[PDB]
């Protein structure tokens, strides 16, 4: 099982219940803390290619207020 590498952080936001390891298709939804607005898709995914993985997009903004 190919693994992407560990899903990145954003500022002023978290991910939901991160998990140790993502695999092929497998998602990651991003939350913004209170009193920031999200922009930017709420979910990237697992990507695999040429035997490696790759995040589908940049995670979303979390942006303030």
């Known amino acids: 099982e190919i693994y ?3 899903p990145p952080q954003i500022d002023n936001g ?4 991160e998990r140790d390891h ?3 298709r497998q998602s990651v939804t991003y939350a913004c ?6 922009i930017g ?5 697992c990507t695999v290619n040429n035997d490696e993985g790759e ?3 940049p ?3 979390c942006r303030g207020c």
């Open 4 to 6: 992407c590498p560990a």
């Open 14 to 17: 978290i991910i939901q219940g």
């Open 22 to 24: 993502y695999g092929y």
């Open 33 to 38: 803390n209170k009193g920031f607005t999200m």
């Open 41 to 45: 898709e709420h979910s990237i995914y």
């Open 55 to 57: 995040w589908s997009g």
């Open 59 to 61: 995670p979303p903004e």
